[PDB]
Amino acid sequence: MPPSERAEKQAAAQQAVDILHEIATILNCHLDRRTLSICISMIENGVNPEALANVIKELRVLGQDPQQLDALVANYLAS
């Protein structure tokens, strides 16, 4: 891929994040650009998007609920 196309694709990637983050805001997804960009990367690498949405939901629960994080650890250690 020649320099012009690489530069155009890098510029379009940035517009993609801008567009998708504005969509995410309209939908009230509570995603910041950092999390959105990570998700974009995983989805572009083949991750199932319904599973990734569950991942985001569960990580949010664990980050807000020390009871559930410690329960997760107890289940993990028991395996």
């Binding site: 997804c29 998700c39 989805i43 319904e50 990734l52 949405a53």
Partner: peptide
Amino acid sequence: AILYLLHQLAD
């Protein structure tokens, strides 16, 4: 799939 992800997280 990215739009599907956003729809799932929509609140």
